[PDB]
Design a protein around this nucleic acid. Structure first.
Ligand SMILES: [Cl-]
Ligand SMILES: [Cl-]
Ligand SMILES: [Cl-]
Ligand SMILES: [Mg+2]
Ligand SMILES: [Mg+2]
Ligand SMILES: [Mg+2]
Ligand SMILES: [Mg+2]
Ligand SMILES: [Mg+2]
Ligand SMILES: [Mg+2]
Ligand SMILES: [Mg+2]
Ligand SMILES: [Mg+2]
Ligand SMILES: [Mg+2]
Ligand SMILES: [Mg+2]
Ligand SMILES: [Mg+2]
Ligand SMILES: [Mg+2]
Ligand SMILES: [Mg+2]
Ligand SMILES: [Mg+2]
Ligand SMILES: [Mg+2]
Ligand SMILES: [Mg+2]
Ligand SMILES: [Mg+2]
Ligand SMILES: [Mg+2]
Ligand SMILES: [Mg+2]
Ligand SMILES: [Mg+2]
Ligand SMILES: [Mg+2]
Ligand SMILES: [Mg+2]
Ligand SMILES: [Mg+2]
Ligand SMILES: [Mg+2]
Lengths: 159, 171, 146, 53, 185
RNA sequence: GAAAUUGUUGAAAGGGAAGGGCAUUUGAUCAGACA
RNA sequence: GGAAUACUGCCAGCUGGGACUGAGGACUGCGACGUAAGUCAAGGAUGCUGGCAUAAUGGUUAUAUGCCGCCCGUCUUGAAA
RNA sequence: AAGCUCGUAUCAGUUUUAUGAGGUAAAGCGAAUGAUUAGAGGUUCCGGGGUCUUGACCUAUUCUCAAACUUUAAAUAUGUAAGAAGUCCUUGUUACUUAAUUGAACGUGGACAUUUGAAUGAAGAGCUUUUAGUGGGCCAUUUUUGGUAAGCAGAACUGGCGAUGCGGGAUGAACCGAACGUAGAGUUAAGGUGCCGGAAUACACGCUCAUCAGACACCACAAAAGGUGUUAGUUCAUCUAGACAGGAAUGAACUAGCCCUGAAAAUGGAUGGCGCUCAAGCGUGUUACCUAUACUCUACCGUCAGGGUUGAUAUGAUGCCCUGACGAGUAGGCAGG
RNA sequence: GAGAACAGAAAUCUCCAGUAGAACAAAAGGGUAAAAGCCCCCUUGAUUUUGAUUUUCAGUGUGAAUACAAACCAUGAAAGU
RNA sequence: GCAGUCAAGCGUUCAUAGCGACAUUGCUUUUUGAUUCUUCGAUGUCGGCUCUUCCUAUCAUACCGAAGCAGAAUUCGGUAAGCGUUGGAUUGUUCACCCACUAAUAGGGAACGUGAGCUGGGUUUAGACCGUCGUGAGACAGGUUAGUUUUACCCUACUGAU
């Protein structure tokens, strides 16, 4: 019959990296997680306790609870035609801080600095990002760069 | 369609590490500038590590025939794909302009070899400057001194359904 | 592609809108390439489109732009107070392009008067069809449909 | 007689008629599953500051 | 053909007129339709829409609720407006001297307001005194205290009231409600 | 004193079914305004 | 060395022929032309003229001609079967 | 279907920027595991004949592979973030925590407005109750399992038929175009323009002659192997210092276009039919033209939405009027008659 | 691989190399080297009281599993488990 | 089931008169399977008899090409379905096997042609017997014997007739 065990189809997902087996480095256990931090989930195959289910591999959530060796993460899961909130009790070895927003905090700091320096001098602070714009006009010189003519090559075998 | 010849000059996008990238030029036969620029990147991607997203078109200019009222013998080198394999061919076309010779070439390739536009690469078009350098007999026969030939069996065009006389084919 | 067409306000055949060219919008055009034809408008094309088939969106309704008073009453706060001011904000993509362009109702065009010029439309313009980017050639096509 | 076993055809189209709705977010979320010792002390901290204010 | 992003010919989903055939209620709707059109006062639009509500959407408002609202800071001299029925409440022993405008008053409610020195007026009398809702206070009764609401959303771990006729020891307290009998919800 | 079904008289069409839709010709028949 | 022309594009340049449509019903608006009075093609047709006033137009009905049209109801993935 | 709370508000079958996850395509085997061809150079008090061979190993190489092998590793799909529930400063509460007012959580007070934190759109957003029918499906492109195969059986994504007419494919539930209130005019789609049949017996360069030619996607079939039929092309040699045959070209080996051989079934027969041969066939290019219930403009009917108007003395405030958009439908629901 | 009376291809003893090519009750896939393997020492947490969460899922049950709270214990010098 | 391509070989010598290995490409729907689309408010079912027409992958007859064709006989191939292709013993048989004549006794289709045309021997209702199997009722694509074959006057087709 069919098999739908807890760790089914996880042959490669939970493997260690090549030449990266063994004990976990100490910086994993020294990081500090607080309620409200954004973390991403990546199960470590050598730690069988506090291991997330395979569905949450590669998912990002928000910490809501902090315990002795584990944290609680909030995950929104799409079930049917709606999203339901899932609460996971995961050990710290299976998570890490998310860099998707640490850079955003830098832009928040930079916006305030540019907002303040323009507060006394210039109107229209212009603190909004823009997408890539079409290129402006330019002049290309041929001094030492005379164009060289190219032609299609004939067919050859060279086997 | 009625082909026109363009020159297209392109370059890689300038970078901080490598400024003033080299300029590359080629002559393209196409119906309009939109097709010509498309063909330029098609051949460039077969020769250099570059594509449209990492390049820029510098200049596109129409090239006119220097002597559009002089009969010339053109030598044409082509590469085309058949139903099984790729082949190189040499053909000779007699006309007054390069664009007219190229249009004849595409018609000839489609008629005799069933080769579409997408399957043909024009390697080189050049004018045979000297007589006795023509090496195809279907072109040499028109180079004879004081060439003359009639047009037997003339067929006239009628604008009416019915005719009141038996037509003649004299000329 | 169906979603992108809705976001560009193209819900029926022979409808047209103006689009500002950025990296965020060029990727939208590649997704709907086999369903649209687009190019670079000229001043005459923009002028004739607005004068003949220019309608404004007022209170969720389609109102003809038959006088400068209605334009001022709806776009005056952006400095636009005439039909030529609206045209200027479009051809030169100004600070208020988004508001001026969204004010215009999507253009309802007819079929081309001399036909499409090709036996089959649903190929790329490069391959002898109709869809894709035809650059400055869009002006001829639009004027026959306007 | 035999019949079809399983298919997901037309299921996504049904889900997009009214569904695919993100959850509504609330400030002051539920404290269910939070550490009981933290909640026990957090209750006393709120009582003290209410008297002060 | 048009690619429609939304349903066509869709009604607004809000009542534009009362469902009742009360001739006197229609007169009040006609009065406040005129006022809402020609006053640009937010009060008149609220009152007009409240006249369209059904019975369950207009819960009764007791006099004790009125007295509590008058205890708000700066609301002692405001006119209480209830689009519905005001009932009596004997649990309170002191009542202010306010003015109350409502569609209906019970016998106990009217007597209690008048005995305290206040007055009970209709909605058309309110319109003459306050055409733009000057110095008014709108009070609404509780909708979720209705007996039908407690059965809505029934299901596992929802804590709702089951729809049952007889309540007792032998009525839906067995397996499914306690751990000693199979499981608990 | 209805219909199925039938006789007589009258009109019309008919080269291996009949019946129908859009449009007009021909025959028959008929209402409305003469302000 | 100096022009012409082709091709492509623009004109708030001018002008001839043909077809379909006339919704609305005191005034109100925005413009144009004028020193002005006023006028106008400016928020939807008016002016002039002829024949007939009845089966002439039109309606109904039978027939003819051109093109099209398979038997309804039902179960069914699928019915003229 | 009934609505309810509100109305600029957050949202989105989408992109962008930033940051994650994956082990399929491909690739790899002088990288691990498992298969696998060929020798070469060495090694035995430790295989066995023979005084030197055949096996075993080891070292450097070599040919070829993997749904249940792998270092590397895409494309397409996929998670999160892009602010007021935010950032910054100062200091209040606690029985939690710290060697320690240390920290953690929640707050008081002060400052920073909508180029307030990318793009585009937004027939408004949010929410609740109740109930119908359905719970045999099938088809097409792409991915894909079993099977020689099947108009066979079974999955994945999307679009369709069922529930759907209309123009085209002669004819057809699914293909192409396009979806439908009643009409008028104009322009087109796919497909076509010798006649049937509305529209060029149009223009241009070639190819093909079949005593079983050919003629348009899905689609109603043809192969290996051959031809001094004819056309174009590749390479080599001979030839002005006269080749080949017996006075200018010739020989050999190959390549692929059309045609031909290969090609046999039962009532009489079907590029749709007639017929068509510098085509009315095949390949390709340029214009003109024909016509859908599609597109543009106008009228009328209905539906929905946003608005105007109670003033008496003339009758319907469920009245009258202004503006914009919309119209397919089985099972089924509701409304007005 | 190189060594030691009986002793040999395999008895016991010694050294060198050895990323796991071993072992971990069982099918297979993961994981693991001063260990999760081997040997030795001490133990009963395979305990008590009830909740929350994950997987199958209707977000029902059952099975299994994860992280705490309140007790009582085992082990260790200890952090811890 | 039938027909090709290649040519190691057979054929005294000699690949291809006639054959042909190892491989490989097809055709046919007169074999049998695979499938379950049509029919369970029913399309009468095996064989034979009778009778017509069609297909060619040609057994005979006409005219030819080829041979390891002297003649005689025979073999291979082409154009050809115009014209013929039988009488019997055993079996319900299709099939098969013999006897004999003959120029020859070729292979097939037409709802595996043909039951309101016949016939009813077989298969496949109810009676009965045997063997094996089953405690038994009973089972057996094992054997044996006995067992109702209905209607055309309508339309069309066909044959004749006004
Ligand atoms: Cl399905
Ligand atoms: Cl007719
Ligand atoms: Cl038995
Ligand atoms: Mg035209
Ligand atoms: Mg076309
Ligand atoms: Mg009587
Ligand atoms: Mg009768
Ligand atoms: Mg008439
Ligand atoms: Mg017909
Ligand atoms: Mg069926
Ligand atoms: Mg039917
Ligand atoms: Mg996998
Ligand atoms: Mg692979
Ligand atoms: Mg059905
Ligand atoms: Mg067809
Ligand atoms: Mg015609
Ligand atoms: Mg042609
Ligand atoms: Mg409808
Ligand atoms: Mg089936
Ligand atoms: Mg029957
Ligand atoms: Mg019968
Ligand atoms: Mg019968
Ligand atoms: Mg039969
Ligand atoms: Mg019978
Ligand atoms: Mg019969
Ligand atoms: Mg019998
Ligand atoms: Mg019997």
């Amino acid at each position: 019959g069919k098999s739908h065990g807890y760790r089914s189809r996880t042959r490669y997902m939970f493997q260690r990296d090549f030449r990266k087996h063994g004990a976990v480095h100490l910086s994993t256990y020294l990081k500090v997680y607080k309620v409200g931090d954004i973390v991403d989930i990546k199960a470590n195959g050598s730690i069988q306790k506090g291991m997330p289910h395979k569905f949450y591999q590669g998912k990002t959530g928000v910490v809501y609870n902090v315990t002795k060796s584990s944290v609680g993460v909030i995950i929104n899961k799409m079930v049917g035609n709606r999203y339901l909130e899932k609460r996971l009790n995961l050990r710290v070895e299976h998570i890490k801080h998310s860099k998707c927003r640490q850079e955003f905090l830098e832009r928040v700091k930079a916006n305030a600095a540019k907002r303040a320096e323009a507060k006394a001098q210039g109107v229209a602070v212009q603190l909004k990002r823009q997408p890539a714009q079409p290129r402006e006009s330019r002049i290309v010189s041929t001094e030492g760069n005379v164009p060289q003519t190219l032609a299609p090559v004939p067919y050859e075998t060279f086997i | 369609a009625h082909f026109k010849e363009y020159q297209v000059i392109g370059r890689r996008l300038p970078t901080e590490s490598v400024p003033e990238p080299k300029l590359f030029r080629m002559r393209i036969f196409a119906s309009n500038e939109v097709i010509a620029k498309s063909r330029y990147w098609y051949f460039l991607q077969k020769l250099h590590k570059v594509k449209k997203a990492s390049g820029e078109i510098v200049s596109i200019n129409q090239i006119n025939e220097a002597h559009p009222t002089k009969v010339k013998n053109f030598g044409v080198w082509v590469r085309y794909d058949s139903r099984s394999g790729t082949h190189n061919m040499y053909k000779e076309i007699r006309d007054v302009s390069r664009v007219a010779a190229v249009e004849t070439l595409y018609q000839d390739m489609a008629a005799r070899h069933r080769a579409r536009f997408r399957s043909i690469h024009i390697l080189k078009v050049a004018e045979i400057e000297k007589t006795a350098d023509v090496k195809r007999q279907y072109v040499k026969q028109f180079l004879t001194k004081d060439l003359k030939f009639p047009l037997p069996h003339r067929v006239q065009k009628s604008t009416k359904t019915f005719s009141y006389k038996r037509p003649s084919t004299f000329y | 592609p169906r979603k992108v067409l809705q976001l560009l306000r193209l819900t029926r055949i022979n409808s047209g809108t103006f689009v500002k060219v950025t990296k965020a919008t060029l990727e939208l055009l590649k997704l709907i390439e086999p369903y649209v034809a687009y190019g670079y408008p000229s001043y005459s094309t923009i002028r004739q489109l607005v004068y003949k088939r220019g309608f404004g969106k007022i209170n969720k309704q389609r109102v003809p732009l038959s006088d400068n008073a209605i334009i001022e009453a709806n776009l005056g706060k952006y400095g636009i107070l005439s039909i030529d001011d609206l045209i200027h904000e479009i051809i030169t993509v100004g600070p208020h392009f988004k508001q001026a362009n969204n004010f215009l109702w999507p253009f309802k065009l007819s079929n081309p008067s001399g036909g499409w010029g090709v036996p089959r439309k649903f190929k790329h313009f490069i391959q002898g069809g109709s869809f894709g980017n035809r650059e400055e050639f869009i002006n001829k096509l639009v004027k026959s449909m306007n | 007689a035999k019949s079809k076993n399983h298919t997901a055809h037309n299921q996504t189209r049904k889900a997009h008629r009214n569904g695919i709705k993100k959850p509504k977010t609330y400030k002051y979320p539920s404290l269910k599953g939070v550490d009981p010792k933290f909640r026990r002390n957090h209750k006393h901290a709120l009582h003290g500051t209410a008297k002060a204010l | 053909g048009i690619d429609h992003t939304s349903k066509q010919h869709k009604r607004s989903g809000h009542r534009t007129a009362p469902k009742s055939d009360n001739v006197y209620l229609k007169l009040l709707v006609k009065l406040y339709t005129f006022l809402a059109r020609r006053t640009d006062a937010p009060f008149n639009k609220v009152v007009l829409k409240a006249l369209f509500l059904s019975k369950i959407n207009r819960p009764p408002v007791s006099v004790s609720r009125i007295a509590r609202a008058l205890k708000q800071e700066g609301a002692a001299n405001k006119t209480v407006v209830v689009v519905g029925t005001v009932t009596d409440d004997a649990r309170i022993f002191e009542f202010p001297k306010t003015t109350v405008a409502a569609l209906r008053f019970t016998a106990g409610a009217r007597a209690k307001i008048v005995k305290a020195g206040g007055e009970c007026i209709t909605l058309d009398q309110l319109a003459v005194r306050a055409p733009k809702g000057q110095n008014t206070l709108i009070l609404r009764g509780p909708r979720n205290s209705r007996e039908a609401v407690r059965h809505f959303g029934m299901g596992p771990h929802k804590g709702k009231a089951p729809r049952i006729l007889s309540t007792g020891r032998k009525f839906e307290r067995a397996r499914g409600r306690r751990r000693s009998k199979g499981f608990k919800v």
